Design a protein around this ligand. Structure first.
Ligand SMILES: [Mg+2]
Length: 65
RNA sequence: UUAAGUUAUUAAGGGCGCACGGUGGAUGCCUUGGCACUAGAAGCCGAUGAAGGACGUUACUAACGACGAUAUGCUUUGGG
């Protein structure tokens, strides 16, 4: 998810997405550990989305302050 | 045939020359790194946690660089 889409999401929506993304990443890590994951690129894609989600959240908090 | 006299051939190995190999890394050529300077710029950083490190971060990671649990990067504004 690109920053623009994240920016549309409400603060709560971002927080929910952060939780959802982290669970997905965890699942991928366990799948890779068990050798069940072929689409390894997904892991990184999820990671960068979480980073983006956190960035937008931080930007909002700084704007508030 | 006998007597007297004389002189070879031997090369186990060695010597000299030559030829053909091996070893070794000199030499020549070369440059990625140095050396000495010139001109302009700049001449501090740190409790708002430094310098320097440690430990981590990648699909698979021993090492180096980069990065810091947003980790082999994130956003944005310009370039391309
Ligand atoms: Mg651009």
């Amino acid at each position: 998810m690109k920053a623009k889409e994240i920016r549309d999401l409400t603060t709560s929506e971002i927080e929910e997405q952060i939780k959802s993304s982290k669970e997905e990443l965890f699942n991928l890590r366990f799948q890779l550990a068990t050798g069940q994951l072929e689409e390894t690129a997904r892991i990184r894609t999820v990671r960068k989305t979480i980073a983006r989600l956190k960035t937008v959240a931080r930007e909002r908090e700084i704007e508030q302050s």
